[model samples]
Target chain A: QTVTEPVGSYARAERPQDFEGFVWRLDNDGKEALPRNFRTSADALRAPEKKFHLDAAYVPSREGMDALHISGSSAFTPAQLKNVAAKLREKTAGPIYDVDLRQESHGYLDGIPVSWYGERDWANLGKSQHEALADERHRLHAALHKTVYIAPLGKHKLPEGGEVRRVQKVQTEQEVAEAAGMRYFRIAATDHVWPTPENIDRFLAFYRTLPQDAWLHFHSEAGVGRTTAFMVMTDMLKNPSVSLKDILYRQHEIGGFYYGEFPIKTKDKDSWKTKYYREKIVMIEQFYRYVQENRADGYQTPWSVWLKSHPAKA
Target chain B: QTVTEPVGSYARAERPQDFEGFVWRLDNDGKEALPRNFRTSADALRAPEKKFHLDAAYVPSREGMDALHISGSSAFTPAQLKNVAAKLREKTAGPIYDVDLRQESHGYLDGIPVSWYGERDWANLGKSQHEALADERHRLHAALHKTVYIAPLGKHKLPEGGEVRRVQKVQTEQEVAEAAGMRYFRIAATDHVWPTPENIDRFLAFYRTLPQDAWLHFHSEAGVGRTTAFMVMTDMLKNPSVSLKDILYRQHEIGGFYYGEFPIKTKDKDSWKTKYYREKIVMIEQFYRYVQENRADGYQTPWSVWLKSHPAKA
Candidate 1:
């Protein structure tokens, strides 16, 4: 059985007019602009495409030719994003929901505060990739996106031996989000890093608040590490009776990304990297247990409220 | 009303014969060799005084005058320890049980194997205080104690910029414990330090194996850190329905030692130290939840068994 080299509608060109769809660059295999409909068993079983259908995708972030770094390498345009949003809305038949889970350089890319894409890119880029993307999201989509900054905002260490602070100043992004609708909550999570207990609690609390028939789309650059983690967690939350093994296995079959092989080990065995992976695995187990306990306790109260109420003993 | 001065049984002297019971010193205000009885609510409620009765005391570790650094200042003697053992056995009406939870300098005290006690002290002292104490434990008591070294036996860090590995060579210590009549199992714990998840699992596993009517004594130098933490954990394990708040509060009431102010904060805000404390508090909460889950699941299997069997999904 020979596989077909799938044809695409969108054409590559320097100008937006050349493309007929959301993106100019196709997947490496020359398929659609993104992976199509990465849904979950929980949504399939519980809502059955009627409501609360979860999906995920890998937002285009490639180096050199395929790069879309906002100010560098043919960044996503507002028209392309609008096309993507419209497609998502049509497919879900509800509000277009999305979550971004990336924590890269602050005002630049790759190197710390280094000039990339010229000085023009430095002056033109938003505070973050999400911010820049939100600056172009559709009116209805923005309302639904809410542009809620959920991740922790404070001085954070960068892998590049430098640090940056996530200051609370996203007025333009917030304005764009509010233009469409509202209630797209964001929760704190780091890419390829284990979350703090505090952030884990917030994640749980935020997920618990979603309606039964909701649709959430999660993405990160390449849509592998952080995106997969949050998606697995969401699946766990929605399908309490499903075994964690099944959740992880099914996710791998669909997304082809193994959560266990994350924070890839190195020759010198980067202890901290592997340490983060182990903790992430443990936290996932803990999350499974937490949902079980929550269900057992009848799901009467919110997790964050209950956790604080029953604060660790003196 | 006015307080009355408490008379002490032990008298300070150069040699063991000069003292009356236990050691050559008394309480800070001159009372006895150690704290009278640091009991727990679980023991008081469940065993009453019939079978099991847990107790704890601070192993003396002073700086100058009252120091007992093996070869330094006038350390504890075999005769004095015999008296303490006799007292414990008499009071419990069963076997003498004790656990040490200090991780200080190896083959030395305070400094990095420095000659504070001179060269002779270095040559004479055992690998650890417990090793030395076991060398002098009562013959029948040794049979009950078992001298089981349960804490993680490997290279460990010292506060004094050094490290030491606990080699598996305690034949003499084991011999003494065997002579005392055996079976005082040891589990891993560190002094004033938060235990690893592996150690916590081990701790929970070991505690679950004990009979409901078994007295276990715990101690650490000054008894304020590891000693209190373990005692609180034991109490929590024993009393499942008891709130964490009640368990911690009751332990403090009886032992007069707080578990919150651990690894005391420094002027420079020693981040790792306090991070350990927070993790410790969270672990205690996690333990409480674990036991509750264990009990709810009917307590048929060991925690370690269940945890491994239900290992985190791939």
Candidate 2:
């Protein structure tokens, strides 16, 4: 595992209410910082010309961030790498993941301790980032859990303690988040065009066991598509009054995924990479309809608990 | 001018980290209750199933709520009105403006207190909702503001001491709102098909005076296109890093305003009642382009604040 020292310092940490956590971009030259701090979604939404925020977080060591970039990151030119080395020294605004995290954040939404970024095959990082950044106590505080809402297509190696003997596809749907150290066990069925009735039942039972405060995390190798699908479910649960299509849009907005962000003038939807996103939306629509049609089974189920027997299906 | 006692009771007030306050709907028939409460936007975004959640906020009296609903409301059939009276009594969930206003909701952008609903000529409400519901104390805590933004079209009677000597087309954009008496000062630009450079200058100057916590209401009579236009500006300021189109869409999601929600099947955008909305989007597109082209002048400017000198003309 690669480990490096934090390049600079921030005397105090200020957590923005709208913060979505820091993300690195393969497309960005290391010189350009990502928009990392916000007071709310609107705060982030309202950021006028984001030239001030220094850079994404300061924790995890520079190598940790480097190792964690998108799977197909463009290899930085030697000079680009050197520029990052120098710039890292000059930047002091972040890696504030743990800065007053417990005191200030107390965390929100099921209490995820940190961004549980990973991929089934990316070996240099994953567990290493967790190991390098958090101590055992912090890990417990974060309470990371794997969600298998989708068929768990790939396997990942967990750090010393992130192990679960077997994670169901529905387990892929678990939601784990962190503001401070509060933990949650939120894994409720949302959308999966073809969620196994068996897995769906398992999900419903497990879902019935959790309380409103229980939050878990959903992921798959390289975040290939699992997390996005999980996010749609969460949004669906948050707004059941609307059709899955509208809720899906809300999910997209919440996740900050841009539709046609790069745009595709297409005669064929198959030609664009964003088509994957379109597919996910379609899956969600089907899933929502299924849930709606099967109201006797799940329309009234609670997310915070486990069910003993499924309710009668419509 | 009209006051009624609160019909129910809540143990205490709660304020979420992103609380926006209460809204009433005449169109809703009072049978449908909007989701008024969220643990936090993050909480809502992270919730498992929304079926368990009822709504946002928990304060405001019956008369206060009534005075707050839109005018030209469907003169409810007597049955509908009676049903509303019965249902509100039956529903124990809300009208909480401050159940945890301070503890839970830190709040979202452009801190306006009430929605500052408008009607071109209805005197039954608008600021009246603020006055009737909020005691002096609530006003102090939830700072309120008003914005007429496009044109100062209508005039309502001020409270005994609530008189203003002059009203600007810009004066209409004063940040005035009330939620249990908490007042704010957040009248940034809300509308502008033709915001005079003079009023624009005043808005910029005044905009700089408020802080991130400043909130206000935006409206121009009909509560149709005018308020929406101002929302774009506020959102524009709140998110300068993005395209106005994106932020506008975000506002649409936040308000749940279906773009073609009440479709007119009309021949021309001009002929439609919502032509004002189309015009606002155009104006914003122009304004956003202007902001983009004049980046040096605005790239660094706070969304809530205006440019030091007008940027180059688009």
Candidate 3:
């Protein structure tokens, strides 16, 4: 009660759809602050070196009024891409990294060939169709040259001969970026659960190699659950000393105070949301404790390794 | 979110002051329900035997309209006592016990000799003032008959060599009741603290001796902190199986969502209220865990005995 937050002083997104997709800058004080709006222009920037934006855009949206105000189904127009690229350049002219975490259709055009906009919708278009949508679907290749698609959810097989959520889709996202002379990295993770030991170790190792100034933009469906969880994980890794409650409270406020809905409509007892809330709190607290206990020269043990040995309690 | 409470359906006290001083009937289900309002009548009662009311009324207000509508200051009129006594009679004709927890003035009239009404304020009143207020202040002796004045605070010495908050003052509160041929008990506790090991043991022992139908009424200055804590402890002692969170949530609602205020106006970090909140939650959670662990035959250790062995962690 000592720190009474003034009413209506909360930083809210201009668009309600992007409210949950908060872009935060991890400041020097080990605190997260919203730096910019999702896919929107900003007048001034703060701590651009530590800037990270989380969004639920399925893919970069197409060019039009419809694409300009789209939510989950992302198709960033050339202008939007240029806007973000210029903003990054204006801030620190540093590398921008896009981390796409989705197992569904590598954000294909109408769930078919990977395209940001509809190219096949044109009447009787052939191989030239791929050429026409090259810059549309592969817009990340042109703007954010450094793009990576990491499926955090557990892998699932597709009806096609080749398996989805496998390295192939990861390769597709990467190839789309690399095709336009952009660099792309690949990593996989789990959703609604702890990442696999191997994935945690691999991701942490990769994260360590990234430049401190790289803008790590993360995306997942709805940008509420997996997106927030991963964002918190990244924040935890960076600022292990911060209290879990503090981080969660800050994140909750920035994310429009949104909470997970019950897993189903009818619930007689503890619902999945309650379990997840408990899980989020308990998991973060335990992680914070682990980081504090083990992140030292005398007792240096990675969280994934320790977690593998002492599995978390409910 | 699964357990959505119906809007505007909360059980609110008929009187605002009595809202925090809830009379909870801790039922066999290990849950608390509002049994009655303070100084108010009830038609039907649930778990009448387990009924307990916590109030802050200084001495239970006097009988007149001026006394009937007062809040903190006490002096219960003859009709009010008759009403409570009759309610207890209807519920089981059981014995009624009043636990007056205060260290200041023994709730005297004008901070002088113990009296329910304004005996000393009577102009030119002499020794006859005592006789006139006898039926008023001493009405509890005729009604409840069983009363205890336990100063649940660190003991203090007075200018009078006899000293207040000592056994002498304790004797006076009992003497006032016993003078009218009533039974009274005494026990000392600490305010805003886990009771001393001896007090815990003594209180538990005394609690075990109470009749099943006895109605326990607890009173403190504001009926906010100490009263709620004691009520929770009593609930934990009776129903160790209930979750600490569940118990706290229920108490918070029944008590009108009242919370402790910051100890001081200026606060930079965690306030005393926050610390107390943590203490309350941790204390209750630990108590619940301890009760569940030691209540069985194999581990038939009492909480007080075990607490002395393994002191609580902050």
Candidate 4:
């Protein structure tokens, strides 16, 4: 259970279709700009490794969207989450998700600073600038990724465009208190700012080695999808030799997620947290995806996006 | 584990020996005391219902005296006790004692309370009055039945004319004690008590029904011989149809002591009970005797002796 590699060489990857990438401020001007064609390979080969990003383009399939509609969260529906969760179950036999993706924001994409947007731009944008941008970024990523966007998606109606527009208008008025001059901009898929195929592969390989049982027993606010990702990454960074099979065996022996779940929270002290409710949705979605793709009854995708996106070698 | 008696009584010979016996006392006043011969019966009959007296006599033999000299606590050196113990070992796998006859006053043919001599008499008695008397009676009965009067055959050590002098002096004191109501006496012999033939046969039968690995474990300070006696009795009591030959085939599945050792204590509290030490010894001894005479090992002994003899049972 030892890791010999330098920490700088290791980076975590997002499940190809889980959450929107980490949020970062691009400019103080408060305008939400989407960066184009960010390349993943260059960032991965660089000293500081790149991270996987989830943006507006990550839209859910019709079924995934329908599930989200029922669940009322932008994130995958309970059924879809269940599908993804099945993948984890296949990998580990224990209770996989203590928390669901809808509960917690997945790890940031490339560790991009959420406050990257210049203060001047945020001030010019008014008090709601950051939130407005976050909303817009969420929508943009959801549309592009072909995945459900809002977490804990259910039957409940969300704020309409009018509300968003009003919020945006309010954000643009707070420009006087600006500090950092950096402009806010979003990265484009074609730009390749995401994790390189080589890096993704390395991460997956390491993920495959994690004890399945440990992942199953994991209790976090995020659903099994997020927990699985976290556990895989943790084990990869900690003990690469521990195989997924052994992990699953131990988890089954110990009585995994069947035991209990955990809570979800944001880094911000003022933010709200959820319990098992959100996790259920995420778990369902993950499980659905897993079964649909891996099982004989599942509709396998034309292209294996996960396999294609391997981590780039340094 | 089921027993069915035959439809008709079969011709069976009456056993030559029986466990029926009693212990009586003659107080100095010539009055039968409250603790007079407590009645007991043979295995087939209930106690109190079939009261009988144990015919006791003192008949010394050359071999018996030799055994006594070698085993006497006061007369025998450490080497002698070992020799006697070893010799007894050859004859029987039972408890043996090295009686200290010298502890008592060597007055001839006189019955005077040992305590009347001095406090030293009481102190040198080795055990409580009740214990010493009980042990002496059992040993005395055993010696008489075995026809080993080793003590009486030994040469008189006192002065030639002093025999009458010592006898008269002790007789006068005894008369005074009798007038005042006191009595004391002492005798010596190896303390090994042999189980009657019937008891051995019973044990052999019982042993045949036990699993190969099963064992009987017992510990007792006073009734080592009695315990072996009980084992024999219990063996005979088991259903004849049930033999160890049949049970040994399922050795691993069988549980309980058949013929093995057990630790008096262990680290785990739940595994054993501390109270069992003194109580279990009496139980095992009584049970061993019961089994030997009655052909019943598993069955409970009659209420009279069982209740009177066992501290816990009472």
Assign candidate 4 its CAPRI class.
incorrect
- lDDT string, candidate 4, A98-133, tens digits: 221111122122111112111111111221224544
After superposition, candidate 4 runs with Cα above 4 Å error: A1-303, A309-314, B1-272, B295-314
Report the error of model 3 at residue A216, Å: 0.9
User: Which residue window of length 10 is worst by lDDT in model 3 chain A?
Assistant: A21-30
Q: Which stretches of candidate 3 lie over 4 Å from their true place?
A: A1-83, A110-171, A176-183, A256-277, A298-300, B1-314
Error of 4 at B41 (Å): 33
Instruction: Specify the CAPRI tier of model 1.
Output: incorrect
Please identify which of the two predictions, 2 or 3, would achieve the higher lDDT against the true structure.
Answer: 3
Q: How does each model score on lDDT?
A: 0.37, 0.28, 0.36, 0.25
Residue lDDT tens for model 2, A157-196: 2111121111111111112112222232322211211222
Candidate 4 lDDT, B137-160, residue by residue in tens: 443334221211011111211011
> Chain A of candidate 2: what's the TM-score?
0.32
What DockQ does predicted model 4 obtain?
0.00
Q: Which candidate leads in TM-score?
A: 1
TM-score of chain B of each: 0.49, 0.36, 0.48, 0.19
Candidate 2's DockQ is 0.00
The candidates' DockQ values read 0.00, 0.00, 0.00, 0.00
In model 1, where do residues sit more than 4 Å from their true spots?
A: A1-314, B1-32, B35-80, B102-183, B260-264, B269-271, B298-314
